[PDB]
Structures are given as C-alpha cells and as structure tokens.
Amino acid sequence: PRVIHINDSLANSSFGYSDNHISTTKYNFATFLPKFLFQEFSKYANLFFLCTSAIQQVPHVSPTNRYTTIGTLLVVLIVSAMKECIEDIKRANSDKELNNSTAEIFSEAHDDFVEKRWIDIRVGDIIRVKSEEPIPADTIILSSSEPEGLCYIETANLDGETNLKIKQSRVETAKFIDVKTLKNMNGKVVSEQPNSSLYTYEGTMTLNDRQIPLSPDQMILRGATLRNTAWIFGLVIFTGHETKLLRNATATPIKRTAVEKIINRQIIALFTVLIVLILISSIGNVIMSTADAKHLSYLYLEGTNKAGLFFKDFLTFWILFSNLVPISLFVTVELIKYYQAFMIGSDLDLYYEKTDTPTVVRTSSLVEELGQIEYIFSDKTGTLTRNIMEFKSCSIAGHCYIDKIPEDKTATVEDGIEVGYRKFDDLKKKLNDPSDEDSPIINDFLTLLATCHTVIPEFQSDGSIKYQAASPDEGALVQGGADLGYKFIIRKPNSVTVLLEETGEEKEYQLLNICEFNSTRKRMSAIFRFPDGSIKLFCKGADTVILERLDDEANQYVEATMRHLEDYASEGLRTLCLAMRDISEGEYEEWNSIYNEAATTLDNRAEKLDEAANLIEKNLILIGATAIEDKLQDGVPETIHTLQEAGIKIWVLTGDRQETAINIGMSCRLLSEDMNLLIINEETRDDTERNLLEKINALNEHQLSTHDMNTLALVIDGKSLGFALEPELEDYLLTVAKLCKAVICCRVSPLQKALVVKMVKRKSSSLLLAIGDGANDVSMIQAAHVGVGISGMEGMQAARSADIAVGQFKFLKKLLLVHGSWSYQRISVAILYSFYKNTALYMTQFWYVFANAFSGQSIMESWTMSFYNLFFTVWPPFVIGVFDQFVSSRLLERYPQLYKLGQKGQFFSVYIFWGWIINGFFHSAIVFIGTILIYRYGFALNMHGELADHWSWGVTVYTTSVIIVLGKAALVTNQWTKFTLIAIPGSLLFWLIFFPIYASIFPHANISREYYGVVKHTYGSGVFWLTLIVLPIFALVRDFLWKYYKRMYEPETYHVIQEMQKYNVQRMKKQRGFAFSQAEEGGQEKIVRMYDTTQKRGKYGELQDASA
Amino acid sequence: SKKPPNTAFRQQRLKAWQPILSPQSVLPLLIFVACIFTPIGIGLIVSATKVQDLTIDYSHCDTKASTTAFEDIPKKYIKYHFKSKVENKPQWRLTENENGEQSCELQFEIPNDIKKSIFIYYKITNFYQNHRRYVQSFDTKQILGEPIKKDDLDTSCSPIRSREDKIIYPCGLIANSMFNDTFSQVLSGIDDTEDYNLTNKHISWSIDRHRFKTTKYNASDIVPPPNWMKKYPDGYTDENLPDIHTWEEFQVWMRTAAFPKFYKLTLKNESASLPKGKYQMNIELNYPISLFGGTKSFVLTTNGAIGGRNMSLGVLYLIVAGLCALFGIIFLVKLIFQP
C-alpha cells in the first residue's frame, strides 16, 4: 500500500508519485513528430502522395520535373505542422493558469506557511486553504478553525449537488492547530491506492506512535471548494492525474468530424476516376504501339513485350494524373478551420464581461459540426441554474404576498377561492395592526422563517450579517425573511435570538428540540420555547407528508393554500408548507423522555429518531406555505425555446435528485403544463422492464400527432438507468425517447453521463453536443462530438479539456445558429471548390492524350502546374472559406427554422460532389476543344509569319483555365467585401503580372528552360487576348443561367431569406412541487449545539471552542 | 483585458455588397454581351475570309505523275481560296535527275495580285511531334555550342547519343528526323509571267537565333546522325560542318509543334506583291512518307489578323452571342407568359 512520511520533503519523492503537472495539450513536446505521422497518414490524400513521389524516382518515367510532387508535399507537410505548434502554445499557456495558482505550503526550514504555486505540491506536504478557495489536490484534513475541527465543501464540480457537506476532522488531532506546534508530526499514512471511487475511501494514519482510522468523512477532494470556514489544515494524498477525480478522463483524443468522414468517401470516388483514366489511356498505348508499328519508325520504339511497356507507361499515367487528388486540400481545410476558430473567439456577443472571459476554441478541427447538431446533452447545476436561491413569495391564510407584482396576476374576485397577489409591506400592515384576525398567524409565521432552521450566523467587519447555511434553501429563507422584519442574529448553544428591527428589541428563543431532514421523511420539525414560557412546535415539509398530520376542525385555510401550491410550482418555484402546533408543558414532559430514550441508544438510532418524531407531530394546524425560487442563468428560458424550434432535442443530465430537476424543467419551459410525465424510477431490473414495456405499449397502439408528441416528456434516474443501458433493452429506451420532447435524467453518475452519450452515438447517425462545467462530466465532453465547456470561477476542469469554452449558456444560441450554420456552409463550398479547381485544369492533360498517340506529354510546363495549387488559386478557397456570409446574423437568429438545412446535410454529399467533378470535366473540354479549333496548325499568330509552338499554346490553356476557375468563384460566392476583390479578381492580376516576370527572368538561370520567347509570342499576339475573352464566357454561360434559374423558378428555402436581406406516470396539473436541497450527512443535529457567535475570535486565527 | 476589439473587420460586419440576380440586372447584361460580341464575331469572319491561300498535296507525286508532260491534280488533293475564280486547275510533273534523285515540279495559276506579304509553309500530317519520347529528346548544351563529352551528355537523346564511341552531334530524335525536302527559292514564272524571288532569311523565332550558335567541337569526334548519311556520307568533314546559327530551316524544326498536323515556315517575301499569272515550284522528293504514314503538303497562305482561313475564333464569338441573345429572349417569354 501507498505510504507517506509526514514532515519530510526528501524521502517522499523516492516513491515516484506524480506531480501536479496536468496536460491538456493533445501531445507533449517529446512525442511530437512520430505521433504526427499517424495524423498525416490518416488523411487518404497525403497517404497517396508519398507513394507517388516514390514512383516518380524510377528514371525516365516522369512527364513533369522529377521533384515537383515532393516539392509541393513538403509545403503541405510544413504548413500543417506550423499549425500544430501554435495549437501547442495556445494550449500550453492556457494550461499554465492552473499550474501557477497559489497555495500556502508548510516549509520546515522557514517553519511558516510560505507562498508557492500549485506545481511544487509534493505528495506529503502540509497545506492551508482559506475561505472560498479551491482545494489543490485530494487531501486529509487535520484541524480547522471551526469547533470540533470541521468545514464545508461545495461539491458542485464533483457532482450536481447544490448543498454543502460536513467534513469533520478526527478528534484525536483536534489540538494541532498551531503553525508553531505543527513541527512535531511523526508517523506514516497508510492509505489505499488510486481507486476512482468518489464516495468511498479507506486508510489508517498513525501519529506519535498511535494509530488513527480514517473514513470518507475525513476526506475532501480536488474539484471541491472550501466554504464557510476560515482555514483548514490538509495533508495531500493524491495529485496530478492520479487523483480520485481525473484518472479516467484521458487526453483530448482525435475526434474525426462529420465533414472529413465524407471527404474520405469522396476521395475513394476519385481513385475510381483515377484508375479508370489509367486503364482507358494506358490500354490505348498498348494498342497504338502495336497497330502503328509501321508508322512510328522515327521514335525508335523497343517493342520487347506487351507487359513491359505497359508497366513503363502505367507509372507515367500514374504520375501525370496524380494531381487529380488535390494536395492543397488537407492544408486549406486546416487553415480555414483554424482561421474560423480565431474568428469565433473574437465576437463581442460571445464575450462575457462580468468575468471577463472571451470564448476560446481549443480543438479547432471541430468547428463545422456546430451546424449539424441534433442532440444537446446539458447539465443542470453550474450550466442552467446560477446556484443561487432567493426567497420569492409566501402565502398564508389564503393570501399571497410578493415584492413585485406581475401584471397578469392581481388579487381578483374569488370564484369560490381567492387567488392573486399582494405587496410585502401590506403584510406588515396586517402585522402591525392589532385589530386584524390574522395577526397572531403572521407573528407565528415570520418567526418560523427565523428560528426553526439550522443556519449559523457570523458578523462581518461591517455590521451586516452573513448567514452560513448547511442547505442553501433555508439560507434563502432567512435572508429573504429578514427583509420582512425579524432579522436573525446571534446563536447560542441553548437558544437563538431574533432582532425585530422596527422595535429594536431582541426576543430570546430557547431551542428545546429539533428534528432533521431526511429523504423519506420529507419534513423537519423544531420544538421551541417562547420567552413567555408557552413552548411551541414548528414544522416544514412536503405536501404529501404534512397533509396526513392535521387537526382538521382547527384550520380552515387548507384548501386555500393547496390552490396556491398548484399555482407556485406551475411557475417553476420550489415550494414548502409551513405548519405548527401548540404544545403544553406536560405533553412535552411525556415525549421528551421518549425522544431521549431514542438518544441514549447507539445502533438503532438512525431508524428510531425518525420514529421518535412521529409521536409528537400528530395534531398540527396550518399557517401557510412559502416558495423559494432557483435563479436560472440569464437568457436560459429564451435560449431553450429557440433551440427547440430548430429541431434540436435538449437532454438534461444532472447529478441532482429527481424532485428538483423537474422543478428546474418547469421554470426553463422545457416542461410545461398540460404535459404528462413518463417517470421511470424503479428499483430492480424487472421493475424497469415492465415499466419500459408499459410505456411503449401504451403509445405504439395508436397514432399520436405531433401536437400530441409535444405533450409528453421522460424522466429517468441513474438507479433505473443502469438497467436500461444493458444491451438487451437499449432499443426500447430509444423508442420511448424518440417521441417525447424533453428528457431529464437525475442522480446520474459520472460514468453514466458518458454511457448515455456512447449509446446514442452508436445507435443513430445523428451528431450530438455536450455542454457543462466541472469535472463530474469531463467524461461526457470526451464522448460527444462537440464538447462545449463553461468556464466558471471555480473548478473549470471541464473548460480545460473542452473543445470550445464559452462564458455561459446563453451564448449557445448565437454559436449554434449563426456561427454554426455559417461554418457548415463556409466549408462545404471551399471543399467542393478545391475539388473542382484541380479538375478544370488537370483534365486537359487527359484530353490531350487523345492526341500525341497515347504517350503522356504534359500540356503545360512542370512548374506552372505546381504554381496552380499554391499561388494563384489558393486565395479563393480562403475568402469563400472565412469571409462569406450566406444569410446574415440578424436573419439567422430571427428565423431559427433555417438550422434544418444543416441537419439533413443538404450542402455536402456525394450526390452533390459529383455535380462539381462533372462540372470540372465540362470546364476542361472547352479550354481544350476551344483551343484546338484555334491554333489549328500552330498558325494563329500574326508576327511576320512565325507560328505558335507547343509552349505558346500550353500557356493559352493555362491562362484560360485560371480565368475560368477564378470566374466560377465569382459566381459561387455570396458577399463581396474588400477582401474578395483582393482574391478573386486580384489573383487574375497576379498571374498576368507574375508570368512575364517568370518568362524573362527565370529561364536565364537554367530553370524552366522552355517558354524562352513565349511572352513575345503570346502577349503580343492578338489571338491570345481574344481567347481569354470568350472561352471563359462560353464555359460560364451554363453557370450564369442555372444560377439564375435556381433563384426564381425553383427556389430553395434560404433563397427567399437572401432576397429578404437585400430589400427588407405523473400528471403536472395536480403536482405540487417539493424541493428541499438538504440531504443526509449535512451534520444536521450535531451542528446546532457546538456554536456561538458572540464569543470573539481565538488567538491563533479563527479558533473557536465547542461551547456546547 | 482579454476583450476582443470592436473593429468592423473582427466582428464580420465588413462593408459588403450583394449580387442581386434580378431581371432588370441580368437581362441588360445579356445585351451587354450580345452587342459587343457580334461586332467582333463578325469583325473576325470578315478578316478570316480575306485570307487567300493555296494548298497542294504533293505527297504521292512519285507514284502518279508522268515524266512527259503536265496533267491535272485530282480534286481530292487541292484546296484553294481566292477573291476571283481560277481559269485552269494547277499542273504538275515528276522529273528524275541524272544522278537518280527525283523532283516534283508544280505549276499553278494565281488569279489576282495579293498586296500583302507572301508566306510558304509545308503542312505535315500524322507526325506525332508532341510525343513524350520526342519533345524532351534533344540536348540543350550542344545547340549552344559547348563541346560536351560523352559521359556528360543528356540521357534524353537515349537511342542515338552514340554509334561507334562517337558524339552524334545534334543528338536527339528531333534533329535526326529532319524534313529534308528543299524548296526552290524562286517561283519561276512561266508563259512570260515575271518570276518571284522568295527568301529564307528570318523564318525562325527571333529568340532562337541568340540560342543557336555555331559549335566549338573538334571535327574528329562528331559523326552525323544516322538519317543524315545521304548528305554527309564520309562523315563530318572539317570544311562543311553545319553552321546551325545560319541554318534557318533547322531552327524551325526544333521548335516542336503541338499536334499531329502542323505548319512549318520555310520561305517568305515581304517587300513586294506578286502579280497575276501562272508560276512554277520545284520540290525534291527526299523525305519518304512511309517513315511516318501521313501526308506532306505545300501551302501558300497569306497571314491574316488571326491567322489563315480559321473561322473558329469568329464562330466561338457567335455561339456565345447566340446563347447570350437566345436566352435574352427566353427571359422576356418566361417572365411575361409565366411570372
């Protein structure tokens, strides 16, 4: 087992534990280049061109120069490598921000807590973590500021839980709180290994020759933050990648996108044309070599065999046509997708100001699935909600009270029952006036907000109070309650106070007994003692448990408050009943023994204390009910309505319990009223089997409409999810899920948030997005196609390994609709163009071999064909790729139905790819056949009777085939900025200036030996300028008219938008939502006793004795 | 501090313009390219029919000619175009010299004077000049005059670089297969028509003359190529080594054309105009036809503004101006009859 020596800086490095160095970059520096070759060979084009340049090196076979296709491979090799180094730097310094963060660390030489970063935290050091500070690594607390050495961690990164957990240090080491008396630590730490089991831990720590057992109670984890405690004293156990949280999540894998999976089925459709066009031509060379052996005597042919000159001309036609595959495709698809990921991460409407965090695209290859999203797998806490509860309204005696009144809701006439709203100061007027009937009820209500809970207050340096709550719901009951009067202040071990601020006096309240919240109890009760001596019972809990404990003849407001609790949860608020009873002095005396007889016992205490409460809460009367609301993040209910108009199906996968993910779903308008649920939360696999079988059977028997498909939703939980993710019922789980609108899954483990993603990925063909924060769903980001992170102020281990990191949820509308459906059209033209520019030119080699007796003479010079991909026609893939908006940003967000173009893939398929290849043939059989009817014998020129050779004709084919391919790009583009005039009609002016410089200067230096005088015999000739005028126009009349006929007489759905731009089973009705965020092990009943806040702070920091 | 700027380029709100394909825009562009192309598409046919040529196929002259007197060429061997009509078909006869070398005299009548300059080309058909084993197969250095030794020769002239450990001087399949057929320098005028002197000066490219220099070889190391043995039977002497700087008809052979049918320039006359009458041409039949299996010919075209009788540039300006004026009326039919 792993052993740790406490108070040792040297010997703990001997065991070879890891360091705090995390790596988010897809490789390191040392494994750069041999990992890089698998990255270059997984593209089928770059795999093909290495073999071709090896084929060129057998002698006397190359029609071109011997080094041209290794000369344009090393450029493709280098530019795709210089992209990779700057995607290493950008993911080095963004990793450096976690490495550089601070931590107080014990150093025995200084004997003081010194300032060092997170990196040098060896396993075995002693650290100190202040308030609201993330824990750097998985540690074991020794002692702390709180009485009995406890603390509170917020596990919002470890799971979806909103409440705080108590982690009490062991009582033996409670005394070692002194940084001066820390220096006597002697012993070992016998622990377990890295286990990746979050809620289980074992270990035995020995100190001063005395063992101490450990527990998961005495352990806090890496992603959790320390809250509501001054400091803790930690001894680090795991670190780096061997933590309990970050071991299963690997590095960023190579995620092959959904466009590159169509390219590698397009290139296979181009090796067919390449193999056919060898076995059409090279078969013909066999025929003409033997059939015209009489008439080819001037060539001195060998004629040795029919299989030697076949293979001596199988490679010539292999080399001449090997530029049919474009080698500049797999670089200008990287350098568009890199320059699009720089344009996404610079938009002000994707920039969160309050944190000052711009969006950043780490993995820049996954930019074009943002237009093909069909499922979204969100997260509830951190992503949807803001993790902040505030008290909204309260209802007592059939009257509702809210601070701001909505304009649709008002206290109207009763229809037999009074509904509506009132302001909060009107509740004070019924409270202050001693004539009204409800004034004893309001006073019994507004102290119940202030006394019954377990919050512990702490004064600030300012006189303003800050409430430290175990559960964040009742932390909003007090703070919202103190706005109404009755502010809660100082707590004592026997009693609490409350300061009535309008009278200034403080009334004591002797806390006699208090019960704790549980899962199945769904209530908690606190028996108090008033300052009058008349003791009292209070209670708060759920509707289905409080309704079975009444005194029915006493209370008459019961029907009036249940109508309000159908009203509250309909708006999406977390409700809570508030009921009391009066208890005499003798009836306490009979029961408080029986509670204590359940207290002296040891082993049945967990099942007898809840029994001990049931004997006393029998006859209750009803005050009313309150409704805390959860703050959804900004723009969340407006986003999800837009994302469901575009056909995307939102799936929520929380880690929270089931009773509050439904309530969040009601407030974000995922759910709605008049929408019955399909709840599957069953124990054993057979009980999921029947309830899976019943839901599918109840709705496949009859056709239900799309209006009736929106009226259904699914809710499942993680205990029931592992039995529907076994491979025998996965098909059933789709068939219920493929009909409902929204799907909520609850209490879902960190593994099962990937096993749902890895199930829909291999069951349908639809892409799917995953969005979240924290490291409980870092496994979900590595399983989905696009994984969006949300960078929070704490944690953000999701935003490390995510492909896109965003500020909050409301930027997902502009990302997926504007920047997603642009980045799918903007690459599905600059790829279909880059497959077309290398076929309108390099087919005139093939239409040449019907002349020249099936030999393979290249129609143009060797270098001028290698300048075609690199110089003159590399710019119109860029300007189409990054600067072309087919519908603007106002119009895509205005009409969200336009996203159904990118879902079905109506822009990029093989049935539309072949429309650009065949258009690349017909554009090459006009620049050829139009230039053999001209230059019919070479007799074209008027220069004193000279003629045009082989090289003053090949330029007329090349210069015409550039001014077609540029002229086609001026018809497929949509928007002419100042950067389009530089590329598309400017690269023509590049070639008509670079060529006379290339024809006078470079031949003198023994390179490109031919066209030694062609610039005289082309540019001065009157035929070369009348060929460039009409031979484009003859081959673009097909394009200029079918583009016109498509806009008017058969228009698609987005063309009218482009024309618009230039000119213009439980049912929810009777469900009263209960959501109390407290869970077991919040340390509910131990924590009320050992506190004070009138006692001043201790000497060494915030040491406070247990005053119980 | 990480806030990206508000420049009008970075937010992709650049000042932009859109193409509105609308029938008040595209339709006055179909009349922009059907009223500037037709006055060119007619202006080129009028300058490709003002070219007057005369094509004589002298290919089978050794077989089908009498040595005695003239006859008519069959119609399937003559194409000719002029302003006026001819009065007699051209005439032709074979003449075997005393040594045993043939000669094919040709007599034709030219129906009117031609004021422009006069060019004489010879048309060769089915001769694959653009074969891959043929274009690159000549040495660059030996044309310039550098005395290259055997080991540093080009490998492109691969079958004929050496015969008996000797430097085949203009190596390469181009210079080995040169057209031998000399053309008589004067159209000798018969029946008291005045004879017409043509010259062969400046028939090559003007940049080939700077590149074609005389050789610095010693004459003891260089043999003729194996198809030049009927002119230099002993070998290359020291006195009549060929000066390729002034050998014009060798320069227009190494400028390799691009199709199996091509013209090659061999004679021209600029300073004057030939008058009407009947003339005579003399051609020696040295180059056989079974070497390539085609048809050598003889043309007398005049150089026009776009070349000879080449209607293809005038027609390609009219199929555009046809389709850009046909669909300029299917606009106004499909608009009005069916909006």
Ligand SMILES: CCCCC/C=C\C/C=C\C/C=C\C/C=C\CCCC(=O)O[C@H](COC(=O)CCCCCCCCCCCCCCCCC)COP(=O)(O)O[C@@H]1[C@H](O)[C@@H](O)[C@H](OP(=O)(O)O)[C@@H](O)[C@H]1O
């Ligand atoms: C050799 C062995 C290999 C054999 C391979 C052959 C065939 C493969 C087998 C099956 C093929 C399968 C399917 C092919 C059949 C149909 C394809 C689907 C139809 C199709 O959308 O494509 C079209 C091509 O339209 C031709 O058709 C193109 C018309 C040109 C056809 C002319 C045929 C020429 C054939 C060669 C001639 C040979 C001459 C002889 C030369 C040899 C000399 C001896 C695509 O261009 P497109 O301009 O419309 O693109 C439009 C348009 O550009 C744009 O304005 C619109 O967007 P926006 O409005 O928002 O801007 C939008 O509508 C966009 O789509």
Ligand SMILES: *[C@@H]1O[C@H](CO)[C@@H](O[C@@H]2O[C@H](CO)[C@@H](O[C@@H]3O[C@H](CO)[C@@H](O)[C@H](O[C@@H]4O[C@H](CO)[C@@H](O)[C@H](O)[C@@H]4O)[C@@H]3O)[C@H](O)[C@H]2NC(C)=O)[C@H](O)[C@H]1NC(C)=O
């Ligand atoms: C016009 O151009 C014609 C083609 O360029 C050319 O015709 C060829 O000329 C060569 C040489 O005169 C002929 O080659 C002869 O080959 C036969 C056998 O087929 C032989 O009588 C002789 O070869 C001999 O070979 C010996 C060993 O190989 C060698 O030692 C001897 O020196 C001797 O060369 C000839 O060389 C060829 O058949 C001709 N016809 C064709 C269709 O190629 C004309 O000579 C040329 N005329 C002029 C006036 O330039």
Ligand SMILES: *[C@@H]1O[C@H](CO)[C@@H](O[C@@H]2O[C@H](CO)[C@@H](O)[C@H](O)[C@H]2NC(C)=O)[C@H](O)[C@H]1NC(C)=O
């Ligand atoms: C072009 O042709 C004309 C004939 O029309 C040549 O002019 C004759 O040149 C010869 C040269 O020997 C003189 O003897 C004649 O007297 C000239 N004729 C006339 C009417 O002047 C002219 O020289 C030719 N151009 C050349 C050969 O470059």
Ligand SMILES: *[C@@H]1O[C@H](CO)[C@@H](O)[C@H](O)[C@H]1NC(C)=O
């Ligand atoms: C002009 O033609 C006559 C007739 O053959 C010839 O004798 C004379 O040399 C020619 N002149 C020139 C300069 O060639």
Ligand SMILES: [Mg+2]
């Ligand atoms: Mg979260």
